[PDB]
């Protein structure tokens, strides 16, 4: 199909370890973006088939979405907060490199990214 297998969300060979920053990323950062009115296009992998975007996964080499990030946090996939922040950054980058500037989806991403950066500015 137009769609790749979704990203893995569990790392079983990794030890399970909480950190203050990972708790913050799940319980403050992800939670705040997840509940936002503009979160909905970002809560699951882009379904290029249903959306008829045949070039999406030609342009986007590293798919990422908030649902994947949420599950990765819930399964303690990330070794540290920077790995999680990188996935958020990738999700926004994908939106900005695929969609035309000023598209509704880009304006949605920009609003979510601003909130993300504001919360990251207070990472413990
Ligand atoms: C990240 N991202 C997401 C999306 C994206 C857009 C729409 C949906 C979606 O579920 N639409 C919908 C609304 C109401 C009823 C049924 C459906 N299917 C999901 C995703 C997208 C589209 C162009 N470009 C991007 C884009 O970059």
Numbering used by the authors: 42 to 165
Authors' own words:
Bromodomain and extra-terminal domain (BET) proteins and histone deacetylases (HDACs) are prime targets in cancer therapy. Here, we developed a new series of potent dual BET/HDAC inhibitors by choosing starting scaffolds that enabled us to optimally merge the two functionalities into a single compound. We merged BRD4 and class I HDAC pharmacophores, resulting in dual inhibitors of reduced molecular weight with a core scaffold of only 350 Da harboring both inhibitor activities. Through pharmacophore merging, followed by structure-guided design, we have successfully developed a new series of potent and selective dual BET/HDAC inhibitors.
